[PDB]
Amino acid sequence: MELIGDYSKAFLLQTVDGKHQDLKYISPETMVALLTGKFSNIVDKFVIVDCRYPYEYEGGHIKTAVNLPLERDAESFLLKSPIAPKRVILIFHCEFSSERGPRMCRFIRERDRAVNDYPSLYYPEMYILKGGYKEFFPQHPNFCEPQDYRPMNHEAFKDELKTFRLKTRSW
Numbered sequence: 001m002e003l004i005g006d007y008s009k010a011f012l013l014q015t016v017d018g019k020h021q022d023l024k025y026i027s028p029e030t031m032v033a034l035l036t037g038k039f040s041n042i043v044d045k046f047v048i049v050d051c052r053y054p055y056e057y058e059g060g061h062i063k064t065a066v067n068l069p070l071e072r073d074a075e076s077f078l079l080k081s082p083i084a085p086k087r088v089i090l091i092f093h094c095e096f097s098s099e100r101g102p103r104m105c106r107f108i109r110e111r112d113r114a115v116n117d118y119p120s121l122y123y124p125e126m127y128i129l130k131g132g133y134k135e136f137f138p139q140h141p142n143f144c145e146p147q148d149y150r151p152m153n154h155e156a157f158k159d160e161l162k163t164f165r166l167k168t169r170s171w
């Protein structure tokens, strides 16, 4: 398997097959391994990027995850003042379409390359959580908060979905 983004070393986490062949996916068990500190001797810091819309996040998210659905906010939070360290790892998730997750992952890499001299990067190691929150929650509900799940297409939030869509850079 290839090395991480800045070609400094191997990817640390075991991966699983996902839709995008070129992206790295991890399972809920691996996400819990990180959260429970199984990689504490190697991973100095990791960030869980929940790119679902706010109402989804508010209805139940993984503990410590940061809600960054808009590219500009993700860029600002991650790249305005780079979270340096050991390894730093980012985990993105926003399942159930328009490829939010993969797109955000690719966007951050694009911006990281743009502010660095090749091949250096602030976030050389990034993964996608396989199955997103929908598959994580029924496996480890006590690692979520609140302990619930609110789908993007929840009948009662059809307007919140539209309202938020109108704040994106492109559709």
Ligand SMILES: [Cl-]
Pocket: 069, 070, 071, 072, 167, 168, 169, 170
């Ligand atoms: Cl956006």
